[PDB]
Design a protein around this ligand. Sequence first.
Ligand SMILES: Nc1ncnc2c1ncn2[C@@H]1O[C@H](COP(=O)(O)OP(=O)(O)OP(=O)(O)O)[C@@H](O)[C@H]1O
Ligand SMILES: [Mg+2]
Length: 312
Amino acid sequence: IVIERPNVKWSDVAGLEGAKEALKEAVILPIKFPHLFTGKRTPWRGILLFGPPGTGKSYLAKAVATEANNSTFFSISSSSEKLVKNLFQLARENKPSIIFIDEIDSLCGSRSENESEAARRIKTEFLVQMQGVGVDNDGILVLGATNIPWVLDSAIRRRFEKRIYIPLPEAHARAAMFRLHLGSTQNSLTEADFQELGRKTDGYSGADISIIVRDALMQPVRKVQSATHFKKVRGPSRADPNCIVNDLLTPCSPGDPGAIEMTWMDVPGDKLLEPVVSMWDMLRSLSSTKPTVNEQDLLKLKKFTEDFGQEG
Ligand SMILES: Nc1ncnc2c1ncn2[C@@H]1O[C@H](COP(=O)(O)OP(=O)(O)OP(=O)(O)O)[C@@H](O)[C@H]1O
Ligand SMILES: [Mg+2]
């Protein structure tokens, strides 16, 4: 029940400007401009974010959480669980409010057979609470997320009249993720290198790239741990960036001029000048990781919208 609002700006989510606008139109505008969405224009009660894994579903929700300017956010995932009655209640008071249930395929499991019988009233204590005997004409909106939506209950599914597809990133959005997940960190990557990576990642999810950048990111760290030699160098003081020093120590090879023998244990905590993440490190991280979303996965996703499409 994370009742908070993290730090994910729209700017942080690459691509998805379609879903962004969809979400601005059904979640932010209604809250900021009540009088617009009154009468016949009442925002749907439930939005569902479906689409392949690692394409932005949960992440997007966080963006909404922070960009949900006035309303307070509420979250849950795959986590005696009758205090669902408690959640909805909580929200009605702090209305306007948003309720986000990540992987709503949590509260479900059908091959058309497989049930934990007490979770049958879980489905129903939720299903019922969305109708509301005390009609919650509050700014209360229910968000859902899932990468296997077809497994949902007709009753549940049809509870989300607005359904948005979160796809695999187009090339442009791909390059932008590498850039971002790197950020304020020291590196030697050119705008050209980002495009080259974007181009080389045909078919990858956001989660996949997120893994790649984290790996390459860790390169200077592996090189410092494993090094056997360090050179004395010029660079920004660890304590004061705008004071250069002729003193830092960076890892190197023995076949290097100015190579002192020692390990990181010998380097003072405040004299290490770490290596920069290079494009070499990206491609290396890249080669050793392959796309997670296969075709049949994406195919079965076309199915879920086969006339299920909107509302039913
Ligand atoms: N559109 C995006 N913009 C920026 N980063 C992204 C994007 N999509 C995925 N990511 C990366 O992956 C992570 C978010 O993964 P996300 O929550 O979207 O996976 P998911 O969609 O919930 O997976 P699943 O669908 O299986 O539940 C972030 O840490 C981020 O680095
Ligand atoms: Mg998720």
